[PDB]
Design a protein around this nucleic acid. Structure first.
Ligand SMILES: Nc1ncnc2c1ncn2[C@@H]1O[C@H](COP(=O)(O)OP(=O)(O)OP(=O)(O)O)[C@@H](O)[C@H]1O
Ligand SMILES: Nc1ncnc2c1ncn2[C@@H]1O[C@H](COP(=O)(O)OP(=O)(O)OP(=O)(O)O)[C@@H](O)[C@H]1O
Lengths: 193, 100, 58, 48, 212
RNA sequence: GCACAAGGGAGCUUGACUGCGAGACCUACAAGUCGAGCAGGGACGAAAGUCGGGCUUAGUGAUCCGGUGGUUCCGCAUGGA
RNA sequence: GAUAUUGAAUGUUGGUACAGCUUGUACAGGAUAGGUAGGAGCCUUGGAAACCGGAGCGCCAGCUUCGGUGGAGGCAUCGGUGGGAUACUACCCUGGCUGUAUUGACCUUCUAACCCGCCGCCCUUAUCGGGCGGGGAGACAGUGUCAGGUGGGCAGUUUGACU
């Protein structure tokens, strides 16, 4: 079954229409990946489905409420060290807790994506989990998401991360979302055709 | 180099998948003759990091390219600094298993 | 061509397409010729497939 | 481009008004106080 | 184990599921049909058993003000000198049950998780933090145990002993099942009943009917 | 047509209002244009007053059928739909 | 193409209706602690420590079961750790096997429906058809409804005004 549906969803800001006539579906455990040029609503779409931003046109219907939002630059991210399944993530990846401001840039996304995976989520709205990760953590992502509770929607900019960790692709393009199921390697085979 | 008619947006009301690009333009417009790239290739795009993968090979030297990618550095590496236990390891090759 | 059990035969009506163009069309009987004893003997007549389901003895 | 604009009320929620505006010179949702004949007073309206 | 026994058979049969040497305790598991990830479909209510449980408790109270004066005559072991959490720090073998009053609960709570992973933290969702401390001591010793569900939506309830007679556990399971029927939250999706497992402490479970 | 500004500035603003409208111009009709004034609520102004878009005339199309919003309307016996 | 004529078996991958139960460690640790509640004892001649073999996972640390040698020993609070205690109760759907009943799809195979402008016999002096006996095809085909594509092979029509 599906969980979230989108129909003719658009968005208006002070460049031009970013986004128009958007028809897509989230399902029961799909691994959906956003690809698209940066600045093309790659993560504005995530704030539309989160209801973090109110869309100008189009109807966004959802069923299950839990929306885990893991964005880029959450900018003195909180230290509510609660619900200790987070600390399993915070200790596989080898990251200490002690500070936030003196940490390197490499540790802070691994300490934000940590809190995001384990609040409670049947639906992940995460921006870019593949920035400043080493391969022992990049490989740990795919074993998370394969062994995961529900649907994941990510904005990767990686041909590497989507050969393993994708079922659908919601490619953003010339102001229009188009979805394709199955892989990313055969996706460009589909587009060129 | 990826902008629309966006000559005046506030530069972190921008997109934030730009603003790496703003830094990048401000460097490469002016021939600064020394660069250090503390992790460039992660916010960029598959058409954006590719041309930076390409032109930095044709760059005229003195580059310090930190990159957690394994495939970006295959175009921008001659020598390596493998930071490890008890400080640096200045490598000039793979330098594993202590060549005998 | 009519069924021997009930008076079920070919009728006629309209082929109404899109734009409601009324072409003129026929409606056949799903009849399916089988061997039945209409008299004391079996005679192999037309039947219908509405009347063949569980009602009439083969 | 120039768009047709309805200006729905807030005290009543009733629409009551139309004028035009730019999507570029006025990219935000515009608001004015006009007269609501259900509310029988001046009321802040709202593009919907 | 293919057959679902009755309530009148399983009470007489969990007599026979006493294997060890201690006089064992018959307890009931019940699989719920709510969603444990949502906080709205949460059954958390406790009730008194008309024939009891068969075990001695030691309830220590955190009564404040005049409420300590009625707490020392109901049957409680130790009340306190209005603050003995410093005596709780670096020591404190806790005994059975911790209840409190709705005034110092916040103060005790701001002390940390010395009650989090130990399951005795006062919380007024369970009827244990109230102004009626005299009525709260007298019902917990003779019945009521603090009841809440897990992270997968299940409730555990001690209804009694092996040595109780056959007519005691029938009313105990009847009272607890009628309580579960009155404690049903809103927006419950579909079939509410999944499984009843009546067991003793030393023995397997018997999946029996809910309404016989 | 305009230098008493209708042309220029700045402040404050939403009258680019609601119900109308005596009487006129125009015109085969359908339409189109002007309208003092009244009431309700406002804007500016100390007040007088002016404001129902722009300096006037262009910037647009009938009905039918559908959509949206609202309504002391109807609703195929009655209550709803 | 579906559906109706049009059913008989043998496997298949999903899912239910009844059912089996196993899988669980960041470090500290004597270790593999998923958590919520009771908890100072339980397991043993209807066998404990230990050895060994194998189904099974494994983040290869060590667990899990079953069977076989053994002979009275394991194991729990407390001791230590650290965010949290080890003997039952359930679950968590993370990660399997096996059977019953249907469910959808696919492959084969059968024959009794249907078909035979195949043979022989009779009706019968008949290249008709039709009864019987074989043979062949055979759930197809044909045929009826429903549907999509294709379709100038055919049909009704349109193909403006000023000048
Ligand atoms: N809040 C905003 N207001 C106005 N314009 C914006 C805003 N956010 C983005 N834009 C414009 O739209 C473009 C797309 O922004 P968007 O929300 O898609 O981020 P994104 O591109 O998805 O992030 P990334 O660049 O990592 O893909 C921006 O680059 C900017 O030019
Ligand atoms: N000022 C500081 N105070 C405390 N710890 C620090 C400080 N600077 C760096 N560290 C520690 O050094 C470790 C490594 O940081 P480093 O500067 O190497 O960045 P990094 O490890 O490459 O991460 P990233 O790739 O995100 O930049 C981090 O775990 C961080 O806590």
């Amino acid at each position: 079954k599906e969980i979230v549906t989108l129909t003719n969803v658009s968005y208006e800001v002070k460049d031009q229409t970013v986004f128009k006539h958007v028809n897509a579906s989230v399902q029961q455990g799909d691994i959906i990946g956003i690809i698209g040029k940066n600045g093309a609503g790659k993560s504005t779409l995530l704030h539309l489905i989160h209801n973090d931003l109110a869309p100008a046109q189009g109807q966004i219907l959802r069923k299950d409420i839990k929306l885990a939002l893991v964005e880029q630059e959450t900018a003195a991210y909180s230290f509510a060290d609660q619900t200790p399944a987070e600390k399993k993530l915070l200790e596989k990846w080898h990251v200490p807790l002690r500070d936030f401001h003196q940490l390197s840039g490499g540790e802070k996304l691994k300490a934000r994506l940590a809190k995001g995976l384990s609040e409670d989520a049947d639906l992940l709205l995460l921006d870019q989990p593949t920035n400043h990760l080493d391969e022992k953590s990049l490989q740990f992502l795919i074993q998370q998401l394969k062994h995961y509770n529900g649907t994941v929607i990510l904005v990767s900019h990686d041909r590497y991360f989507l050969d393993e960790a994708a079922t659908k692709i919601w490619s953003l393009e010339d102001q229009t979302l188009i979805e394709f199921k199955g892989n990313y390697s055969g996706y460009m085979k589909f587009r060129e055709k | 180099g990826f902008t629309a008619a966006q000559w005046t947006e506030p530069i972190k009301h921008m997109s934030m998948g730009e603003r790496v690009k703003i830094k990048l333009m401000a460097y490469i417009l002016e021939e600064k003759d020394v660069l250090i790239l503390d992790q460039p290739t992660n916010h960029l795009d598959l058409p954006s990091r590719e041309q930076l993968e390409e032109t930095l090979s044709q760059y005229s030297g003195t580059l310090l390219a930190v990159s957690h990618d394994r495939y970006f550095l295959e175009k921008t590496t001659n020598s390596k600094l493998v930071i490890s236990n008890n400080g640096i390891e200045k490598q000039l090759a793979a330098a594993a298993a202590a060549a005998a | 061509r009519k069924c021997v059990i009930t008076g079920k035969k070919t009728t006629a009506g309209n082929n109404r397409s899109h734009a409601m163009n009324a072409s003129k069309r026929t409606w056949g009987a799903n009849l399916q010729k089988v061997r039945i004893l209409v008299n004391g003997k079996p005679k192999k007549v037309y039947v219908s497939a509405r009347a063949l389901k569980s009602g009439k003895v083969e | 481009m120039r768009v047709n604009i309805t200006l729905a009320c807030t005290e009543c929620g009733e629409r009551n008004y139309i004028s035009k505006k730019n999507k570029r010179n006025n990219p935000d949702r515009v608001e004015f106080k006009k007269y609501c004949p259900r509310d029988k007073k001046s009321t802040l309206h709202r593009e919907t | 184990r293919s057959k679902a026994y009755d309530v009148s058979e399983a009470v007489a049969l969990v007599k026979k599921t006493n294997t060890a040497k201690f006089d064992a305790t018959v307890e009931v598991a019940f699989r719920l049909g709510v969603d444990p990830r949502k906080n709205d479909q949460q059954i958390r209510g406790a009730v008194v058993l008309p024939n009891g449980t068969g075990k001695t408790q030691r309830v220590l109270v955190f009564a404040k003000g005049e409420k300590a004066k009625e707490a020392e005559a109901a049957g409680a072991d130790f009340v306190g000198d209005t603050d003995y959490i410093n005596k709780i720090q670096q020591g404190w073998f806790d005994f059975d049950v911790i209840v409190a009053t709705p005034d110092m609960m916040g103060e005790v709570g701001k002390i940390g998780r010395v009650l989090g992973p130990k399951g005795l933290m006062p919380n007024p969702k369970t009827g244990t933090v109230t102004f009626e401390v005299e009525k709260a001591i007298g019902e917990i010793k003779a019945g009521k145990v603090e009841y809440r569900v897990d992270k997968a939506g299940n409730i555990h309830v001690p209804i009694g002993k092996v040595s109780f007679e056959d007519e005691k556990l029938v009313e105990n399971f009847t009272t607890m099942y009628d309580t579960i029927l009155k404690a049903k939250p809103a927006a419950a999706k579909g079939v509410y009943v999944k499984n009843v497992a009546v067991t003793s402490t030393m023995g397997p479970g018997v999946k029996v009917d809910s309404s016989t």
